Write a protein that binds this ligand. Structure first.
Ligand SMILES: CCNC(=O)CSc1nnc(C(C)C)o1
Ligand code: NA
Length: 330
């Protein structure tokens, strides 16, 4: 089997991407944030505290003939940005892009934090990290990809995120029309539950490539590129007037600037992030200070290749016996 679904930016900045997901029978279509940095499939639901719902589409298990309570199971998750959600669990049929999993754990939110409520465009998350990170207790649950994987033609999914445009998530096959050149594969550590890999270095603009190991995660659920402070300082030093602002919470730059590209290594290959991808626009409406798309990881504890980096590539999440990660230019 395979599946193929279009993923669409939620706003003009590509802050996140939503992908339609069919849950239940008859189908209830929710727009979920596919997150390779977490492992819970959770949704706004008929159980979500009413004051915490503002415009989201909700899953109503009582209207699904295939929904069953996963008796006694609860979940609770905290993300890197400080957001959180929790609730109880149903099993139901879940389809993505024509690929169906029966008996998928669908984590129904009873509570969500303010950042979720305030985003009407995201109806929940679909985690694609390793199932070892799933928060369901007392019986940990599998991701959609791990429930799908044996059924797939190949044990892979691919992320093809657009810059200010829709893109694609494919399951079970690699679309050889979707990238240019060849795919470079690189090893993955599952030790922390993530698609954790080591980049071979970086360049700023037209500068020389610096060979250096940077261990980080491929995380579709993080907007920005978070790298060591040395690397980030080297990048922003090439932008007149850029500075780190503790009041704003990271590097800002004059909106009049033209940003340099950023290159990261994948083995002997190179992925180039155009400068425009690193522009996240005014810090507040009408401001002439703009927020940078490359930020320091020094206050995280991990480097994160988020959407800024991933959208510059065709990315293969190879879930073979020994998982790996492929990158191609596009
Ligand atoms: C195909 C998705 N599998 C899982 O989520 C299982 S947890 C897990 N931790 N390491 C692995 C192997 C891929 C090495 O798997
Ligand atoms: Na922000």
């Amino acid at each position: 089997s395979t599946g193929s679904a279009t993923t669409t930016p939620i706003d003009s900045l590509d802050d996140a991407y939503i992908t339609p997901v069919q849950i239940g029978t008859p189908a209830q279509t929710l727009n979920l944030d596919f997150d390779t940095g977490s492992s819970d499939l959770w949704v706004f639901s008929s159980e979500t505290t009413a004051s915490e719902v503002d415009g989201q589409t909700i899953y109503t298990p009582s209207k699904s003939t295939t929904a069953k309570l996963l008796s006694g199971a609860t979940w609770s998750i905290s993300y890197g940005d400080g957001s959180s959600s929790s609730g109880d669990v149903y099993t139901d049929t879940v389809s993505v892009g024509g690929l169906t999993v029966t008996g998928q754990a669908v984590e129904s939110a009873k509570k969500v934090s303010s950042s979720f409520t305030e985003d009407s465009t995201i109806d929940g998350l679909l985690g694609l990290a390793f199932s070892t990170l799933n928060t369901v207790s007392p019986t940990q649950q599998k991701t959609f990809f791990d429930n799908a994987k044996a059924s797939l033609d190949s044990p892979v999914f691919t992320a093809d995120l657009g810059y200010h445009a829709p893109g694609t998530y494919n399951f079970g096959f690699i679309d050889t029309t979707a990238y240019t050149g060849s795919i470079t594969y690189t090893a993955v550590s599952t030790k922390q539950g993530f698609w954790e890999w080591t980049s071979t270095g970086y360049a700023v603009g037209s500068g020389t490539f610096k060979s250096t190991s940077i261990d980080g995660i491929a995380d579709t659920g993080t907007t920005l590129l978070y790298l060591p402070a040395t690397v980030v300082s080297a990048y922003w030093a090439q932008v007149s007037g850029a500075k780190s602002s503790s009041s704003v919470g990271g590097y800002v730059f004059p909106c009049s600037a033209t940003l340099p590209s950023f290159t990261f290594g994948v083995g002997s290959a190179r992925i180039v992030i155009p400068g425009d991808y690193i522009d996240f626009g005014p810090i507040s409406t009408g401001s002439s200070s703009c927020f940078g798309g490359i930020q320091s990881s020094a206050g995280i504890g991990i480097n994160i290749f988020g959407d800024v980096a991933l959208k510059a590539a065709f990315v293969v999440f190879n879930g073979a016996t020994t998982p790996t990660l492929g990158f191609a230019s596009k």
